[PDB]
Design an enzyme around this catalytic site. Sequence first.
Site, short mmCIF file in Angstrom:
data_model
loop_
_atom_site.label_atom_id
_atom_site.label_comp_id
_atom_site.label_asym_id
_atom_site.label_seq_id
_atom_site.Cartn_x
_atom_site.Cartn_y
_atom_site.Cartn_z
N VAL A 1 -22.77 -7.28 -52.78
CA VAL A 1 -22.84 -7.22 -51.34
C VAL A 1 -23.54 -5.95 -50.86
O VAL A 1 -23.33 -4.86 -51.41
CB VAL A 1 -21.41 -7.27 -50.75
CG1 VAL A 1 -21.42 -7.10 -49.24
CG2 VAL A 1 -20.68 -8.55 -51.15
N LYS B 1 -24.26 -11.15 -49.06
CA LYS B 1 -23.80 -11.34 -50.43
C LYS B 1 -24.80 -12.19 -51.20
O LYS B 1 -25.17 -13.28 -50.78
CB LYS B 1 -22.41 -11.98 -50.54
CG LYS B 1 -21.98 -12.22 -51.99
CD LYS B 1 -20.51 -12.55 -52.17
CE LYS B 1 -20.04 -13.73 -51.41
NZ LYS B 1 -18.60 -13.95 -51.65
N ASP C 1 -12.47 -14.81 -49.25
CA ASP C 1 -12.44 -15.35 -50.65
C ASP C 1 -11.39 -16.38 -51.02
O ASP C 1 -10.84 -16.22 -52.10
CB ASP C 1 -12.31 -14.20 -51.65
CG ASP C 1 -13.53 -13.32 -51.80
OD1 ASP C 1 -14.65 -13.85 -51.66
OD2 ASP C 1 -13.35 -12.13 -52.07
C1 LIG Z 1 -14.00 -9.09 -52.15
N1 LIG Z 1 -14.45 -8.64 -50.84
C2 LIG Z 1 -13.73 -7.53 -50.22
C3 LIG Z 1 -15.57 -9.21 -50.18
C4 LIG Z 1 -16.26 -10.30 -50.67
N2 LIG Z 1 -17.36 -10.84 -50.01
C5 LIG Z 1 -17.80 -10.32 -48.85
C6 LIG Z 1 -19.00 -10.86 -48.21
C7 LIG Z 1 -20.08 -10.00 -48.15
C8 LIG Z 1 -21.36 -10.41 -47.57
C9 LIG Z 1 -21.49 -11.69 -47.08
C10 LIG Z 1 -20.36 -12.61 -47.17
C11 LIG Z 1 -20.54 -13.96 -46.65
C12 LIG Z 1 -19.44 -14.80 -46.76
C13 LIG Z 1 -18.15 -14.38 -47.36
C14 LIG Z 1 -17.99 -13.10 -47.85
C15 LIG Z 1 -19.13 -12.20 -47.74
C16 LIG Z 1 -17.12 -9.12 -48.35
C17 LIG Z 1 -17.46 -8.46 -47.08
C18 LIG Z 1 -17.50 -9.27 -45.86
C19 LIG Z 1 -17.74 -8.67 -44.64
N3 LIG Z 1 -17.88 -7.29 -44.57
C20 LIG Z 1 -17.82 -6.50 -45.66
C21 LIG Z 1 -17.56 -7.08 -47.00
N4 LIG Z 1 -16.04 -8.63 -49.00
#
Ligand code: A1BLA
Length: 337
Positions: free
Chosen positions: A35, A50, A165
């Site tokens: 990410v 992501k 998640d």
């Molecule tokens: C395990 N963790 C803590 C995660 C996993 N995935 C994402 C994530 C990160 C970027 C895009 C995403 C699109 C859909 C779902 C999740 C994401 C994020 C995130 C989302 C928003 N702000 C900051 C971080 N955190």
Amino acid sequence: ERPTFYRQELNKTIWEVPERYQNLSPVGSGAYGSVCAAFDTKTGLRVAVKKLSRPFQSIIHAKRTYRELRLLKHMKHENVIGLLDVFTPARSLEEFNDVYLVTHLMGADLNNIVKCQKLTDDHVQFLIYQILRGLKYIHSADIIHRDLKPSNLAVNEDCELKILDFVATRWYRAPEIMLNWMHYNQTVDIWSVGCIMAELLTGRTLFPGTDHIDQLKLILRLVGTPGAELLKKISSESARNYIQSLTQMPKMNFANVFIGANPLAVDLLEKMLVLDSDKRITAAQALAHAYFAQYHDPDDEPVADPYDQSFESRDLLIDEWKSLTYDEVISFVPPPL
Ligand SMILES: CN(C)c1cnc(-c2cccc3ccccc23)c(-c2ccncc2)n1
Ligand SMILES: Fc1ccc(-c2n[nH]cc2-c2ccncc2)cc1
Ligand SMILES: Fc1ccc(-c2n[nH]cc2-c2ccncc2)cc1
């Protein structure tokens, strides 16, 4: 490629995204993907992008990619992570190999907010309210999260929270999962919420089991060994022998275990951390609990559009899952600005 893409390397990983997204900086990485934070010039929003890792390396990965994209495209709720965008630099199915997901940037996870310290009662009320409001929505779609824990809860400085998640995961897992029951239900998520809420109130992990057996032991210490009604529901002879061979323990008095906490919080904990999953409070019921009187609004706790998970039972080829995923990328419609 309708928009113009640009390529760059960040921490050995290659990022190819549309020029609308600027100033990418890494925030974290995992086995499922990496990410970056970025600035979305089209909306003026800070976003998280992501990049999925090896999304179509195997049938397993391909089906997981499809699963994740389908889920994320369906989640449209203020307390559940959803999608602002989804894209691929590929111009056709033939060259399709990478999938990028975009959502609003969230500042931190709940574990960071906890700082291993006690939150005020108002903060506990608002954070748990939000978790339950999101959980009502998820559950209404016949989805079980199954892995709720502080690190899967995104929180902003204004205390706005979103579930992500769908440290140790086992600490927040329902006892019936430790026992490997094949027919657990959505209230496994309520168990997790109870464990989270207890930790926010006390500043300590409620059940810090070192392994699955230790985890169950710690749980039974608090809520007591199973009563007759619950024992009748255990099919496994080996499991019954094990459980009935434990020195029996009575349910502890939650009022004393959590002395000092708001009595309403204690009452709710008692309704969430019930050993028999059939007797645990549901998310919808919990929202109506007096503990949340300051936040509950029955007209603003929406349910989800039905969600078809029939694909879960299908056995398809790797290129079939890839094509289905590509279709989902192409059909994406962004939410109104
Ligand atoms: C395990 N963790 C803590 C995660 C996993 N995935 C994402 C994530 C990160 C970027 C895009 C995403 C699109 C859909 C779902 C999740 C994401 C994020 C995130 C989302 C928003 N702000 C900051 C971080 N955190
Ligand atoms: F936490 C757990 C999870 C599962 C078991 C288990 N299920 N069937 C049999 C047993 C069991 C485990 C350990 N020793 C004897 C029997 C026992 C404890
Ligand atoms: F020791 C325990 C701890 C929890 C369970 C459990 N709670 N809800 C459902 C069950 C359960 C566990 C195993 N098989 C059926 C149902 C049963 C025994």
